[PDB]
Ligand binder design. Structure first.
Ligand SMILES: COc1ccc2[nH]ccc2n1
Ligand SMILES: COc1ccc2[nH]ccc2n1
Ligand SMILES: COc1ccc2[nH]ccc2n1
Lengths: 245, 179
């Protein structure tokens, strides 16, 4: 993550991020809506950061420092570039919506009144097809990635030293290889929870309540399709084991 | 410090997310209670042993039978949650959550946890449940269910007041350590 965005999302809530003289100008219902929208953007910034640790710290470090067999790094980090592209673009749109809403003379005081339209755009058309295809591939390769990691850590000394070295800093405490993989798999199922709570506090404008209701429906359709398209791949699986499912 | 993995399971309104938030947070959430929990690695010292306990939530995965099991690999301890204000969350334990956890986490200790124990003496809770011919889950009903499902143990807590929260995670650490 970059310092500007980390500082903008350092507070535990929107009510603590904005100036107290700005907070006092809003109704409690607007504050509750903004606290949940702030949590969605903050968790998206963290999710994009998890993908950057996977691509830049782990993947690139293994390619430039280790002598692994070809196709081993891809097996540990399936679809990470496609996932980074999807979420970095989504994050850019959320952060631009926040930026446009800032008051002149402020870098922290804003109210986002129109999130629904951005969520419908993200969870419909080509971007939804790309998310569905990429998560169906990633989640089907999840178990294989974890097993490959465990095999490499148990049998390769240089791999163990590499992992222990790059995961040593306290800021990486929650972000080991297996932890990153599960954080990415669990991300998609956080969206309906966040969207439903934003919707609970967005009844003031009927257009907004409708847009968030449509967005919630699209996210659920996307999740149902991903869930139906998953079948765990296993290294060395035989065709007979596959067609006897 | 040895690394252990904990996963919490249970119905959507069982309070599992709130329990993980209250345990992990430095300072109780007085201004905003988060909607979701990402992960956390708690430094715990129980009975003289230091453990790094990775904490994971299954919230949002309840309707997705192929995504949800991806949370289980290499779990060392399961917290199986129900809400004391919801006798229906306790009924879903033996033939929905228990067979799933036994299948994906064989030989992993399960601690059955009754959440929201503060609502057992809440008059609004008692009036609402009485309309559907119900009452808050009794301590003996929780213990009997834990006994029936082969749980390692039975515990109660309140995320709202923090009572019993530290004890649940210290016991989970002890269960994860047993060979
Ligand atoms: C029940 O009290 C509160 C306080 C702050 C909040 N922010 C969003 C929901 C919400 N609820
Ligand atoms: C913490 O309160 C929450 C959590 C998740 C939610 N989804 C919809 C409302 C809602 N509230
Ligand atoms: C959620 O998927 C599964 C798969 C196999 C199972 N056996 C018992 C419960 C169960 N659930």
């Amino acid at each position: 993550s970059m310092e500007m965005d980390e500082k903008d999302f350092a507070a535990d809530s929107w009510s603590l991020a904005v100036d107290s003289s700005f907070l006092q100008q809003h109704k409690k219902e607007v504050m509750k809506q903004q606290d949940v929208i702030y949590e969605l953007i903050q968790t998206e910034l963290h999710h994009v950061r998890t993908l950057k640790i996977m691509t830049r710290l782990f993947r690139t470090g293994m390619l430039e420092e280790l002598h692994l067999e070809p196709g081993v790094v891809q097996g540990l980090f399936p679809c990470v570039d496609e996932l980074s592209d999807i979420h970095t673009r989504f994050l850019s749109q959320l952060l631009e919506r926040r930026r446009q809403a800032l008051c002149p003379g402020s870098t922290r005081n804003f109210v986002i009144h129109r999130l629904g339209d951005l969520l419908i755009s993200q969870f419909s058309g080509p971007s939804a097809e790309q998310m569905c295809k990429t998560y169906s591939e990633f989640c089907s390769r999840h178990s294989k990635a974890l097993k490959l990691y465990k095999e490499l850590y148990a049998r390769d000394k240089r791999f163990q030293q590499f992992i222990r070295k790059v995961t040593r800093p306290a800021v990486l405490k929650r972000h080991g290889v297996q932890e990153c993989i599960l954080l990415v798999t669990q991300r998609i199922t956080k969206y309906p929870l966040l969207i439903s709570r934003i919707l609970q506090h967005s009844h003031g404008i009927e257009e907004e309540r409708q847009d968030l209701t449509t967005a919630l429906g699209l996210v659920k359709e996307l999740l149902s399709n991903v869930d139906e398209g998953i079948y765990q791949l296993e290294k060395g699986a035989r065709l007979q084991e596959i067609y006897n499912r | 410090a040895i690394r252990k993995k904990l996963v919490i399971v249970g119905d959507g309104a069982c309070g599992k997310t709130c329990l993980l938030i209250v345990f992990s947070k430095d300072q109780f959430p007085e201004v905003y209670v988060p909607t979701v929990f990402e992960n956390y690695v708690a430094d715990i010292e129980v009975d003289g042993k230091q453990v790094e306990l990775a904490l994971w939530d299954t919230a949002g995965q309840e309707d997705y039978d192929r995504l949800r099991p991806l949370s289980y690999p290499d779990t060392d301890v399961i917290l199986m949650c129900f809400s004391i204000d919801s006798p229906d969350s306790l009924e879903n334990i033996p033939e929905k959550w228990t067979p799933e956890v036994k299948h994906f986490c064989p030989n992993v200790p399960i601690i059955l946890v009754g959440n929201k124990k503060d609502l057992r003496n809440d008059e609004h809770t008692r009036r609402e449940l009485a309309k559907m011919k119900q009452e808050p889950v009794k301590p003996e009903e929780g213990r009997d269910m834990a006994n029936r499902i082969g749980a390692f143990g039975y515990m109660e807590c309140s995320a709202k007041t923090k009572d019993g929260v530290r004890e649940v995670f210290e016991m989970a650490t002890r269960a994860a350590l047993q060979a």
